[PDB]
Amino acid sequence: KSVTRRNDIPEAAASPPSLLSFLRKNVGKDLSSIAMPVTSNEPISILQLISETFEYAPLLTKATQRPDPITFVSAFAISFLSIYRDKTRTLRKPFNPLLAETFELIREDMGFRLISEKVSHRPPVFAFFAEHLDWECSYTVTPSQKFWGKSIELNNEGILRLKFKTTGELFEWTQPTTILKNLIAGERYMEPVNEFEVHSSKGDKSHILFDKAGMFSGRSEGFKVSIIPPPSSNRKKETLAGKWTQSLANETTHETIWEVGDLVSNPKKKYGFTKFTANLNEITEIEKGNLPPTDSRLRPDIRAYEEGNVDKAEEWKLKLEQLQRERRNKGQDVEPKYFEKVSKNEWKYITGPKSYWERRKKHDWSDISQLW
Numbered sequence: 001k002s003v004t005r006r007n008d009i010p011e012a013a014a015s016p017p018s019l020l021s022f023l024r025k026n027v028g029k030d031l032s033s034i035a036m037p038v039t040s041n042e043p044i045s046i047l048q049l050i051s052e053t054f055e056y057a058p059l060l061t062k063a064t065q066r067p068d069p070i071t072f073v074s075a076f077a078i079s080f081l082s083i084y085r086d087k088t089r090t091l092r093k094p095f096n097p098l099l100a101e102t103f104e105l106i107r108e109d110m111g112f113r114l115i116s117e118k119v120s121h122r123p124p125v126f127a128f129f130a131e132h133l134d135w136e137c138s139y140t141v142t143p144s145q146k147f148w149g150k151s152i153e154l155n156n157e158g159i160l161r162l163k164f165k166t167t168g169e170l171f172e173w174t175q176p177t178t179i180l181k182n183l184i185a186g187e188r189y190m191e192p193v194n195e196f197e198v199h200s201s202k203g204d205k206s207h208i209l210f211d212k213a214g215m216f217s218g219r220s221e222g223f224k225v226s227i228i229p230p231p232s233s234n235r236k237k238e239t240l241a242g243k244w245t246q247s248l249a250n251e252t253t254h255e256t257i258w259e260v261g262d263l264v265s266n267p268k269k270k271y272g273f274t275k276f277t278a279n280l281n282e283i284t285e286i287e288k289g290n291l292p293p294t295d296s297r298l299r300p301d302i303r304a305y306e307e308g309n310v311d312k313a314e315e316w317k318l319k320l321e322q323l324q325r326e327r328r329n330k331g332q333d334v335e336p337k338y339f340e341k342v343s344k345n346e347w348k349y350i351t352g353p354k355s356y357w358e359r360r361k362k363h364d365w366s367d368i369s370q371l372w
């Protein structure tokens with residue numbers, strides 16, 4: 001089966017507030033558990049944003065069918081940055097999910113399904129588990145930001161663990177650091193920095209290094225990828241090149257490996273969302289009547305905001321956070337249901353008759369309370 005999607009969202013209802021305003025105005029001790037106005041947000045939660053890591057999942061599927069899978073895993077690993085190609089996307093942030101808030105994403109068109117949940121509030125910890133017939137990926141991430149003085153260091157702390165269900169081979173990597181520049185003057189934007197690597201359980205390793213731009217060619221967008229197989233295996237060295245804002249190719253044969261999809265129409269007036277982004281908060285035939293009470297698609301503030309009601313959304317954002325606060329203080333902390341801690345910084349999808357997907361088949365959410 002298949003479903004129809006909006007591939008669009010209403011235009012932004014308010015202009016973007018300044019981030020540096022909050023920084024200096026809120027230095028004192030130091031941010032984190034400091035609230036921000038709803039207008040500083042884009043119409044999706046962090047759970048949904050991280051889900052965009054899978055916009056180009058077909059790359060992983062193709063990887064399971066190529067003698068040199070790491071080159072495609074490397075394309076996928078870098079692909080997520082493309083959502084920041086239209087600078088507008090860097091002007092706002094996702095809504096902060098409530099503890100135990102969830103987000104499921106089933107893309108039958110791409111043959112995969114994903115389930116995610118906020119497993120911790122302080123520090124904030126998000127757990128993801130994506131599934132496809134030929135692969136699966138788990139992720140325990142903690143987004144961290146650090147005011148560097150004239151810019152902000154953005155890092156998703158955590159290892160993405162990819163697994164080929166075809167052969168059981170494993171791939172791991174941490175998403176690369178990004179820097180939000182032009183906090184002072186000029187139009188804000190983000191660009192990746194330094195480098196990161198994708199390591200294979202079979203020894204193969206991929207090294208990605210982003211070009212540098214400190215004061216001239218504006219935003220950095222190019223990058224090189226050096227594939228390095230284990231000297232011993234029949235596999236051999238390869239090289240890739242491209243721009244995380246457009247595409248990646250095998251630089252030896254100059255063949256395109258990955259390309260960006262489409263942004264929504266008139267992106268500058270719609271947070272710079274890609275079409276995939278715009279489809280994240282839509283309730284289609286897939287979700288209709290199948291969601292637990294905690295999915296991000298059911299949040300009132302995000303919904304009202306998406307539909308343009310600033311005041312109404314602001315009312316709701318304050319309400320949701322206040323309620324979580326009271327539950328917290330009463331010690332009636334809502335505990336995550338679909339992931340369990342396996343170690344420090346590591347959560348794992350709970351399997352069984354009480355797992356997410358099993359409960360879903362029979363709408364078994366009797367023990368699940370409304371968070372708002």
Ligand SMILES: CCCCCCCC(=O)OC[C@H](COP(=O)(O)O[C@H]1[C@H](O)[C@@H](O)[C@H](OP(=O)(O)O)[C@@H](O)[C@H]1O)OC(=O)CCCCCCC
Binds near residue numbers: 033094144
């Ligand atoms: C790489 C992936 C990108 C992900 C970007 C993530 C950016 C980020 O989490 O910061 C946002 C925060 C402010 O949140 P805010 O919306 O008011 O969320 C609420 C507050 O944290 C509030 O204190 C809390 O109540 P508490 O009192 O009960 O805890 C509520 O439960 C929360 O809902 O400000 C800061 O910590 C400063 C950092 C600024 C950086 C911005 C980047 C755009």
